Amino acid sequence: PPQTGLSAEQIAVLQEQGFELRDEGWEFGMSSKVLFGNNLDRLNPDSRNTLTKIARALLAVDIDKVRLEGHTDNYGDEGYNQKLSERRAESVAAVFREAGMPAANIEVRGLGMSKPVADNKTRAGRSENRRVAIIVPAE
Amino acid sequence: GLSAEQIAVLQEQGFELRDEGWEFGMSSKVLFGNNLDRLNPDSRNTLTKIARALLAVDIDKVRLEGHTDNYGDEGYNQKLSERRAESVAAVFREAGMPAANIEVRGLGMSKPVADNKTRAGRSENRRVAIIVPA
């Protein structure tokens, strides 16, 4: 399949919103520390507003299908981190639905600690791993 | 203490007078469902109504107390219970309750109302309580 499903107008929005093109599509990893702070799956209220802006920016150029993927670092129990990561992605999904993203077009996954982008030996690396990613397919 | 009009509202809302104040306990299953500390939307709406009923008669100070059963890790259950009480606090602040007048506590498994030896009792113990000091 050619990766020509997105127009330049759509790519431009993805770039401005912080997305980078990766193997599974355009991806923006959002810091869980920023999104949730000390909470479990409840979003900071300011972060809810931030997320709504991103959803609306995407919807304004007809990017109306996303995958939301939750991730953790390697601290704690693996099953718990998987559950936490799924619930965190689901919280983001709720905000995207409220902004108008069609519910049938949102796929939610929790990957727990299984797909790190950084080394878990460092606080910085662990924080980079604690994220919720938005993925927009390029197909 | 509380005025007659305030007591009448608390009684109407289903609060019961206990040693530490008027108390209204709510099921964590109903409040959070499968979530961790994110309230489900219907429960948010129900909590907002309670907050507004209280604020309409100048009940503007509460304690929110989160509880668990004794199943699972003690430390996690305590954090969970504190975070769940904080979620309810956030709803009350959004309704207009002064932030400085809200006390949030997570008791974990330490203060059961029912028998943890039974499933029924463990379920009753998984709750968040709204308390209005008398």
Residue numbers in the entry:
A (entry chain A): 30 to 168
B (entry chain B): 34 to 167
Question: What sentences appear in the manuscript?
Answer:
The tripartite signalling system YfiBNR in P. aeruginosa modulates intracellular c-di-GMP levels in response to signals received in the periplasm and is a key regulator of the SCV phenotype. The effector protein YfiN (also known as TpbB or PA1120) is an integral inner membrane protein that functions as a diguanylate cyclase, consisting of a periplasmic PAS domain, a cytoplasmic HAMP domain and a catalytic GGDEF domain. The third component of the YfiBNR signalling system, YfiR, has a key role in the signal transduction process by bridging YfiN in the inner membrane and YfiB in the outer membrane. YfiB can release the repression of YfiN by sequestering YfiR at the outer membrane, which requires both membrane anchoring and peptidoglycan binding by YfiB for full activity.
Crystal structures of the periplasmic domain of YfiB were determined for two different constructs: from residues 27–168 to 1.58 Å resolution, and from residues 59–168 to 1.39 Å resolution. The longer YfiB construct crystallizes with two molecules in an asymmetric unit while the shorter construct crystallizes with only one molecule per asymmetric unit. Analytical ultracentrifugation data confirms that YfiB(27–168) predominantly forms a dimer in solution, while YfiB(59–168) is exclusively a monomer. The structure of YfiB(27–168) is an OmpA-like domain with a core domain consisting of helices α1–3 and a four-stranded anti-parallel β-sheet with topology β1-β4-β2-β3 (following the numbering for the core conserved domain of Pal28). The N-terminal fragment visible from residues 30–53 includes an additional strand β1’ that packs anti-parallel to β1 in the core β-sheet, and helix α1’ that lies parallel to helix α2. The YfiB(27–168) structure reveals a weak asymmetric dimer whose interface buries approximately 421 Å2, or about 5.5% of the total surface area for each monomer, with a solvation free energy gain ΔG of −4.7 kcal mol−1 upon formation of the interface as calculated with PISA29. The predominantly hydrophobic dimer interface is formed by the N-terminal helix α1’ and strand β1’ of each monomer. The interfacing residues are mainly on helix α1’ and include Leu35, Ser36, Ala37, Glu38, Ile40, Ala41 and Gln44, with additional contributions from Phe48, Glu49 and Leu50 on strand β1’ and Trp55 on strand β1. Following superposition, it was evident that the N-terminal region of YfiB clashes considerably with YfiR, thus inhibiting the sequestration of YfiR. The weak dimer observed for YfiB(27–168) may help to suppress its role in YfiR sequestration by maintaining the linker in a folded conformation and thus inhibiting YfiR binding, although further experiments are required to confirm this.
